Write a protein that binds this ligand. Structure first.
Ligand SMILES: *[C@@H]1O[C@H](CO[C@@H]2O[C@@H](C)[C@@H](O)[C@@H](O)[C@@H]2O)[C@@H](O[C@@H]2O[C@H](CO)[C@@H](O)[C@H](O)[C@H]2NC(C)=O)[C@H](O)[C@H]1NC(C)=O
Ligand SMILES: *[C@@H]1O[C@H](CO[C@@H]2O[C@@H](C)[C@@H](O)[C@@H](O)[C@@H]2O)[C@@H](O[C@@H]2O[C@H](CO)[C@@H](O)[C@H](O)[C@H]2NC(C)=O)[C@H](O)[C@H]1NC(C)=O
Ligand SMILES: C#CCN1CC[C@H](CN(CCCOC)S(=O)(=O)c2ccc3ccccc3c2)C1
Ligand SMILES: *[C@@H]1O[C@H](CO[C@@H]2O[C@@H](C)[C@@H](O)[C@@H](O)[C@@H]2O)[C@@H](O)[C@H](O)[C@H]1NC(C)=O
Ligand SMILES: *[C@@H]1O[C@H](CO[C@@H]2O[C@@H](C)[C@@H](O)[C@@H](O)[C@@H]2O)[C@@H](O)[C@H](O)[C@H]1NC(C)=O
Ligand SMILES: *[C@@H]1O[C@H](CO[C@@H]2O[C@@H](C)[C@@H](O)[C@@H](O)[C@@H]2O)[C@@H](O)[C@H](O)[C@H]1NC(C)=O
Ligand SMILES: *[C@@H]1O[C@H](CO)[C@@H](O)[C@H](O)[C@H]1NC(C)=O
Ligand SMILES: [Cl-]
Length: 526
């Protein structure tokens, strides 16, 4: 219940899980609160305390804008923060098996949320099941999002960019220096994350300051080469200045701009984040990772292509319907409360929504490659095409291109295609296997029988949890005891992947081959 860390003693709490016990330390601080003069700076190291920090409840989530699009609807509100928002949010959580393990493998979760939202205290990120079932230690941290995490005046240390990434990094450092005291093995640390968390994971594979802070990596529904994941220096500076103008902070001395922004209330900053771009989309990442010359020393596409990344094993995957979640945030004709049959004209309007800065010819090229039908008369054709357009462009084809490029430098890589729709999914049926709804299976929520999942879903979560644990401990995501399908490595030639479902788990080849040749080879030219 009392662990001695290098900055002071922390008290945890006992959780009863599946007739066993897990020790949770919720809300350990891992940096100086980035407040006052420290707003927009890289996280500063923490000063020793002499009392017993009571790590007995989740800490503040970082300041962020809330999804208010569907008040009272669990499908959206399950992602909104469930603790107070504050700038004082650089805290992390540890779940250790009980009895305290000897040399446990460590899983570090990095949440997504488009680099603008997210918190580690969400119900679907509860690491106690993994600590109970697989006897790993699960760590998760809060890191700054939006402008407070990623405002960029490149080269200027008052606002250098990538601060939320450096938050993630300082937490990884904390695990290196302290996790042995919890029974963890600092030499067996696997990062995993979803969406922007997955893009975050992939960027730690590229950052030299992260090389020695983890062993292996898991990327769920995201990678740095996704089109939303990295902001250019020109965009980043134009957005910093547009924020300055919007807050009355325009100055000629760039440091005076930052100091001005330091006296604004977080709410002033949050309110104006949405407007630093002239045309947004449901996938806008207004303030995100940039090439700062510190965390990121060059354009990550160049680093990937030329093999400049940590050489290790990766597990990468995507969900069958990544794109549908974003259609009900602006695409015309779409609604979670009907079946969203749209017309050709609504489809064309939807491309304007999702590709506003793209030429007419670019948008016609999407239409041409996605509207050659197996049946001109299926009424869901355009509804499903727009989902696939958004899913393939933003998630699936970048994840596949990342995995090809990464594996060509010699490392084992494993790719999955998650195609199970949760029986408890609150969103409608036409949205399918949505973005983010593999996470509850990874964290083992269906292992709780009291929670209305089916038996087939319990079995699927059990096999997924074991494959993820075996990947973390041993670099190999097999389930070896229950005559399971062997998961083959993904190679750039054959491109084998494993499907995850309740019925039959299958080895397939060349996911979205026709679609990704469009997105990866044609569309970037437009
Ligand atoms: C770089 O930013 C400018 C300025 O953006 C405007 O001011 C901000 C404070 C905010 O309110 C934005 O929404 C404003 O648009 C962009 O210039 C605008 O571009 C649009 C269309 O491109 C045009 O209709 C507006 O009149 C422009 N406004 C001004 C003041 O020039 C500019 O496009 C940005 N560059 C890029 C590449 O996005
Ligand atoms: C599905 O619903 C959308 C969204 O419309 C809203 O939600 C519905 C559930 C219902 O309560 C509507 O009255 C709401 O307006 C419909 O798209 C709208 O259609 C109207 C028709 O008058 C159009 O003027 C609006 O601009 C549309 N709104 C949006 C956001 O696109 C859509 O037609 C419905 N589709 C089907 C097949 O029923
Ligand atoms: C269900 C559900 C959650 N919804 C799914 C979509 C919604 C987008 N959000 C902002 C909400 C308001 O604006 C549209 S978001 O979480 O902040 C966001 C923003 C940009 C992103 C870019 C790439 C990948 C994920 C991103 C996430 C949130
Ligand atoms: C930190 O916690 C200390 C002990 O908390 C109490 O005792 C333990 C054994 C549990 O039963 C726990 O639930 C109890 O609340 C407090 O004495 C101390 O004041 C706390 N420090 C704070 C709140 O700053
Ligand atoms: C804990 O275990 C260490 C070795 O870890 C193993 O080797 C490294 C290189 C990784 O591949 C990792 O996944 C493996 O589990 C030992 O060196 C160390 O002394 C051990 N310490 C204690 C206290 O148990
Ligand atoms: C493996 O399966 C266990 C129970 O499965 C049953 O017993 C085994 C021995 C076989 O006969 C099997 O076909 C039966 O259905 C589960 O309790 C266990 O959690 C499973 N483990 C994993 C890692 O998926
Ligand atoms: C901006 O002001 C800072 C001190 O606040 C100073 O170090 C810097 O050189 C100034 N730059 C100018 C005036 O261009
Ligand atoms: Cl083509």
């Amino acid at each position: 219940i009392i662990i001695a860390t290098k900055n002071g003693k922390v008290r945890g709490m006992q959780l009863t899980v599946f007739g066993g016990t897990v020790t949770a330390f919720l809300g350990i601080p891992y940096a100086q609160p980035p407040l006052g003069r420290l707003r927009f700076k890289k996280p500063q190291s923490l000063t020793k305390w002499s009392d017993i920090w009571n790590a007995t409840k989740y800490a503040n989530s970082c300041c962020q804008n809330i999804d208010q699009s569907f008040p009272g609807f669990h499908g959206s509100e399950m992602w909104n923060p469930n603790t107070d928002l504050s700038e004082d949010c650089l805290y992390l959580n540890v779940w250790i098996p009980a009895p305290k393990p000897k040399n446990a493998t460590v899983l570090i979760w990095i949440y997504g949320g488009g680099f603008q939202t997210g918190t580690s205290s969400l119900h679907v990120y509860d690491g106690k099941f993994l600590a109970r079932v697989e006897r790993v230690i699960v760590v998760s941290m809060n890191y700054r999002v939006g402008a407070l995490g990623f405002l960029a005046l490149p080269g200027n240390p008052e606002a250098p960019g990538n601060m939320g990434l450096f938050d993630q990094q300082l937490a990884l450092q904390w695990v290196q220096k302290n996790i042995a005291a919890f029974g963890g093995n600092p030499k067996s640390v696997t990062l995993f994350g979803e969406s922007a968390g997955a893009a975050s994971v992939s960027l730690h594979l590229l950052s030299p300051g992260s090389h020695s802070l983890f062993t292996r990596a898991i990327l769920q529904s995201g990678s740095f080469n996704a089109p939303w994941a990295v902001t250019s220096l020109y965009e980043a500076r134009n957005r910093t200045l547009n924020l300055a103008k919007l807050t009355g902070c325009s100055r000629e001395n760039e440091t005076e701009i930052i100091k001005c922004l330091r006296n604004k209330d977080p709410q002033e900053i949050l309110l104006n984040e949405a407007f630093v771009v002239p045309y947004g989309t449901p996938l806008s990442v207004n303030f995100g990772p940039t090439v700062d010359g510190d965390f990121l020393t060059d354009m990550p596409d160049i680093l990937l292509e030329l093999g400049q990344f940590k050489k290790t094993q990766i597990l990468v995957g995507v969900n069958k319907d990544e794109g549908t979640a974003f259609l009900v945030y602006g695409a015309p004709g779409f609604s979670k409360d009907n079946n969203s049959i749209i017309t050709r004209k609504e489809f064309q309007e939807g491309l304007k929504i999702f590709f506003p800065g793209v030429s007419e010819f670019g948008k016609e090229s999407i239409l041409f490659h996605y509207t050659d039908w197996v049946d001109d008369q299926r009424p869901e054709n355009y509804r499903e095409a727009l989902g696939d357009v958004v899913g393939d462009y933003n998630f699936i084809c970048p994840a596949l291109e990342f995995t090809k490029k990464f594996s060509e430098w010699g490392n084992n890589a494993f790719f999955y295609y998650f195609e199970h729709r949760s029986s408890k999914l609150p969103w409608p049926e036409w949205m399918g296997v949505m973005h983010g709804y593999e996470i509850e299976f990874v964290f083992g929520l269906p292992l709780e029988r009291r929670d209305q999942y089916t038996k087939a879903e319990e079995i699927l979560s059990r096999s997924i949890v074991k494959r993820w644990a075996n990947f973390a401990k041993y670099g190999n995501p097999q389930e070896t005891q229950n005559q399971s399908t062997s998961w083959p490595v993904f190679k750039s030639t054959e491109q084998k992947y494993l499907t995850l479902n309740t019925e039959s788990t299958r080895i397939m080849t060349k996911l979205r081959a026709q679609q990704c040749r469009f997105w990866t080879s044609f569309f970037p030219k437009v």
